[PDB]
Design a protein around this ligand. Structure first.
Ligand code: SIA
Ligand code: A1AU2
Ligand code: ZN
Length: 189
């Protein structure tokens, strides 16, 4: 197991927090959220920079992963608009198809339902949760990942690709999509 794959395994096994309906204060390219447990400094490194207002921003969700450098609570992207109404049921049910080739002659497919609970969702959150799922259920990063990818397809045919042999690019972590319009998620291992 390369150091590279070891490092991916370490990163995607880190704790994450899903914080809901908080205020974020923007100064420069950092947005500070505080609750009763933690303070998080969220770095804007992409087109999120054009969306978050200078100063106070209300009613945001944040998907938090602490990046590696001491006593830091730095995270990157992961900011969304909170749900406009309460959803007790899932916002959307999505077919997740994980395909795995083993040896020379075997294909295997796991087909489940993937629960979307948020009207708007960051690529950060999709990427991190799906990889953690694959670590947990499909032995991701036990072997070299090679050309392994996730693809998220929207109802209109738009799609987003996460290549599993590197981290998600930091400029993509603050990109957001409409959870209602996700159609399916396919993974090729
Ligand atoms: C324009 C669009 O909706 N999707 C495009 C995405 C996104 O621009 C970025 O992934 C956002 O981070 O890039 C690519 C991909 O991911 O496979 C091609 C695809 O057409
Ligand atoms: C290689 O750079 C980007 O990486 C993504 C996967 O990491 C995804 O495939 C992107 C989708 O759209 C284009 C413009 C082809 O840019 C791609
Ligand atoms: Zn409901």
């Amino acid at each position: 197991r390369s150091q590279a794959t070891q490092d991916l395994s370490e990163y995607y096994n880190r704790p994450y927090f899903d914080l809901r309906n908080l205020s974020g204060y923007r100064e420069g390219n950092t947005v500070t959220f505080i609750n009763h447990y933690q303070q998080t400094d969220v770095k804007l490194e992409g087109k999120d920079k054009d969306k978050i207002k200078d100063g106070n921003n209300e009613n945001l969700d944040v998907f938090v992963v602490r990046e590696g450098r001491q006593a830091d609570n730095n995270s990157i992207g992961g900011i969304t608009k909170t749900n406009r109404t309460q959803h007790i049921d899932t916002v959307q049910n999505v077919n997740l198809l994980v395909s795995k080739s083993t040896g020379q002659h075997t294909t295997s497919v796991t087909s489940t339902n993937y629960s979307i609970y948020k009207e708007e969702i960051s690529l950060k959150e999709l990427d991190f949760k799906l990889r953690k799922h694959l670590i947990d259920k499909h032995d991701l990063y036990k072997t070299e990942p090679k050309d392994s990818k996730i693809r998220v397809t929207m109802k209109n045919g738009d799609f987003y690709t996460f290549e599993l042999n590197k981290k998600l690019q930091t400029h993509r972590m603050g990109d957001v999509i409409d959870g209602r319009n996700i159609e399916k998620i396919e993974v090729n291992l």
